[PDB]
Amino acid sequence: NENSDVSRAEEFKSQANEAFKGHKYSSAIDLYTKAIELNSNNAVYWANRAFAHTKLEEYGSAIQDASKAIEVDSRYSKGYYRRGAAYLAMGKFKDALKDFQQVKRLSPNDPDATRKLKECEKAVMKLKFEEAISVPVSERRSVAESIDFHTIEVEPQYSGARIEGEEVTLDFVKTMMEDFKNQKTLHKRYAYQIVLQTRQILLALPSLVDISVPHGKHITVCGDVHGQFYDLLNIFELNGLPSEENPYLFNGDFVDRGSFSVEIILTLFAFKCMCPSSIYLARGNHESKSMNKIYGFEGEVRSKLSEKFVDLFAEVFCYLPLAHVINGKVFVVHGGLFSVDGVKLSDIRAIDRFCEPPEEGLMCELLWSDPQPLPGRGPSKRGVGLSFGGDVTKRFLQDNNLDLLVRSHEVKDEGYEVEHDGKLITVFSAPNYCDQMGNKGAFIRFEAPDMKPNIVTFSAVPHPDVKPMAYANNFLRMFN
Ligand SMILES: [Cl-]
Ligand SMILES: [Mn+2]
Ligand SMILES: [Mn+2]
């Protein structure tokens, strides 16, 4: 059957490349799929759809597409290049080393092939040391055990904000945010005060927090912000600062990727210190030593804070709750649902969350999952977690007497998308993601008692000339 039309397939490829130039990666993937359907022996099509997949952080789909590209042409170096870029993007340095070994073997005198190979060799042995000294955080002394914040002297020439006494006050938070806005810094004493007080608050919280919004009051659910501090300031300017009267739920992924991650996490933690009922912080996948070590937050901390804040921030992130339930009706996780059925809220509440997210179990799945339009389950596009359909959402909701599922974790054009017949809503509060996506951000206000989700969208604001991934892993920087 010679029924493949190369002309129509090349028409789809150019259309997909045009959508690629315009950062319309989902449309590009669709057009590459149509191109592949009409011609599956062109490895360039597979490599391009893989490239578009990595742009959407769909690294599993990327690896699979690049693998089919390699299957088509053994000597197509761009297939191995794309697969290794996807592996490198998700931290699998050894697999990246394999694919970049192959990339050099094909083009043997190309300077960049040997360069990326020597780069990956340095990275894998560096990772060998890092992995050899890896110890579970629950078997380690807390940083709080060896640092009392009252002991830290503040030199009189420090011009930034000061916490007088034990209490974090709204006046200090406003001064801290204005200093952060002008690219100033907070003293180590007050950073330690904030983070150590936050450690106290979070460790006494269950893994699933029941949030009670009484009759007539409201709450704002926010999605990923990934270190875009100036868009966080925009959210607060458009919707009001966190307060007992105007509470916030931030659905994980506060840091990494964006280059103002320290300022966000210090602002969010301080608001929690000031009035705990004024803000609720769920955990994301990027509140993890695995992610922060390579995606910017850890390097941002080492630059603006010190090296002990790295372990302290990791420990505090391990204490973050995994989920929230608003008025016993609205279920808010970051990632999604699970590979098994019959999971009740009691199961989530009882999770021993004080560890780095494993590669298996309820914790990993609720932090990494994505919804799919078709019913059922399927392999994760990210290679971590799973894809769950509308039947999974509906069963979980009726099983738990819940009305709605709210989640984030995935970028959206308008900052939101309603799926699963109005039972799942993705919310994403990082507009113009990575300074290149061009999307709007969004947040959802919930007013009691009827709990109708009032979605509000917003656009990005300017910020100082600090490029994304600035403090991130060097090798991950020189791609995209
Ligand atoms: Cl993410
Ligand atoms: Mn996420
Ligand atoms: Mn995210």
Residue numbers in the entry: 5 to 484
What does the paper say about this structure?
One of the phosphatases responsible for plant phytochrome dephosphorylation and thereby increased activity is the phytochrome-associated protein phosphatase 5 (PAPP5). Studies by Ryu et al. have shown that the PP2A domain of PAPP5 dephosphorylates the NTE of AsPhyA and AtPhyB, whereas the TPR region binds to the C-terminal histidine kinase-related domain of AsPhyA. A C-terminal inhibitory motif blocks together with the TPR region the active site of the PP2A domain, where two catalytic manganese ions are bound. Like mammalian PP5, PAPP5 is activated by the polyunsaturated fatty acid arachidonic acid (AA).
We crystallized AtPAPP5 in a monoclinic crystal form that resulted in a dataset at 3.0 Å resolution. The AtPAPP5 structure shows the characteristic bilobal shape of a type 5 serine/threonine phosphatase with two manganese ions bound in the active site. Three TPR repeats (TPR1: V10-L42, TPR2: W50-V76 and TPR3: S81-L110) are linked via a long helical linker (P115-T173) to the PP2A domain (L174-N484). Instead, we observe a coordinated chloride ion in our AtPAPP5 structure. The AtPAPP5 structure represents the autoinhibited state, in which both the TPR region as well as the C-terminal inhibitory motif (K471-N484) block the active site and deny access for putative substrate-like phosphopeptides. Here, the prominent hydrogen bonds between the carboxylate group of E61 to Y437 and R261 are of particular interest, since both amino acids are involved in the coordination of the substrate’s phosphate group.
